[PDB]
Design a protein around this ligand. Structure first.
Ligand SMILES: *[C@@H]1O[C@H](CO)[C@@H](O[C@@H]2O[C@H](CO)[C@@H](O[C@H]3O[C@H](CO[C@H]4O[C@H](CO)[C@@H](O)[C@H](O)[C@@H]4O)[C@@H](O)[C@H](O[C@H]4O[C@H](CO)[C@@H](O)[C@H](O)[C@@H]4O)[C@@H]3O[C@H]3OC[C@@H](O)[C@H](O)[C@H]3O)[C@H](O)[C@H]2NC(C)=O)[C@H](O[C@H]2O[C@@H](C)[C@@H](O)[C@@H](O)[C@@H]2O)[C@H]1NC(C)=O
Length: 242
């Protein structure tokens, strides 16, 4: 049995750590056959993620609190290795105790670690020792944080997904407050980047949401939730982590 890392914090100490990488799914896909993952963010194949997805064990993944993080991995062991790093997003998980730190890259990502034209070649080594370090996350400019409403059930129990969180990348607490009776009530971490609000009878009127990065940093989106909100509906805010 192989014991996990630790466990990576928001301590951005720009230096490389060892880890074993492998890939899963299609060779030119974004990992999950459905292009989604343990985090609950979907379309990880399309931009911005654009298939540069990956999986990590407890240390990296952190039971869903690492969802959003960005890491930089590079290969310099076996040939055909670009030598240069690729910026990966953590949108899924894999807890197999095969090594202290483990990354399970997409075919796209795993390939990107290779010198131009050697992709598919390098993808057939399956497992190799890579090097990495977490990094703040950068998205296209102007790209703010987006909240997606999930498929409901019992009369309004909500559940919001949060994507495109720059810098820390990952969330560790969400909370609300409707029009009147402010005080920011927490939220349940249903799973991954999905947060749940059991009660919803009282909570009425454009809601404000406060996110707290792994670091403690916080932000506030006033509306982003009218009232005529319907599951699947998507809201974009004017707030982000710098
Ligand atoms: C490396 O990162 C990992 C990834 O998170 C860290 O390890 C996780 O740390 C969590 C600490 O919050 C642990 O807590 C969960 O498990 C607790 C133990 O529960 C016993 O009974 C429950 C029954 O429900 C079983 O499931 C468990 O298996 C266990 O046998 C559990 O009590 C706790 O929930 C309770 O406390 C929280 C506040 O801590 C509270 O909000 C809850 O309402 C409840 O009162 C918690 O359960 C969670 O899982 C499901 C989520 O939906 C819930 O919201 C959440 O409560 C995790 O077990 C643990 N994960 C692993 C290692 O598999 C780790 O921080 C470490 O954390 C410390 C506290 C200790 O658990 C270490 O062993 C653990 O490695 C980090 N490394 C380190 C060392 O920092």
């Amino acid at each position: 049995k192989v014991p996990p890392g630790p466990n990576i914090t928001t301590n951005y100490n720009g230096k490389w750590l060892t880890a074993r990488a492998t890939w899963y799914g299609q060779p030119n896909g974004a990992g999950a056959p459905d292009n989604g993952g343990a985090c609950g963010i979907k379309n990880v194949n399309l931009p911005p993620y654009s298939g540069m997805t990956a999986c990590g064990n407890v240390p990296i993944f952190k039971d869903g609190k690492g969802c959003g993080s960005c890491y930089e991995v590079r290969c310099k062991e076996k040939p055909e290795c670009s030598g240069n790093p690729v910026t990966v997003y953590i949108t899924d998980m894999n807890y197999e105790p095969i090594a202290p730190y483990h990354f399970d890259l997409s075919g796209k990502a795993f390939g990107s670690l290779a010198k131009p034209g050697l992709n598919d070649k390098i993808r057939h080594c399956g497992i190799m020792d890579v090097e990495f370090r977490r990094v703040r996350c950068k998205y296209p400019a102007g790209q703010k944080i987006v909240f997606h409403i999930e498929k409901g059930c019992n009369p309004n129990y909500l559940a919001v997904l949060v994507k495109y969180v720059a810098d820390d990348g990952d969330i560790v607490l969400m909370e609300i407050q409707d029009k009147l009776s402010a005080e920011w009530k927490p939220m349940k971490l249903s799973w991954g980047a999905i947060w749940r609000m059991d009660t919803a009878k009282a909570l009425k009127g454009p809601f404000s949401i406060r996110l707290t990065s792994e670091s403690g940093k916080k932000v506030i989106a006033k509306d982003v939730i009218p009232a005529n909100w319907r599951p699947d509906a998507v809201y974009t805010s004017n707030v982000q982590f710098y």
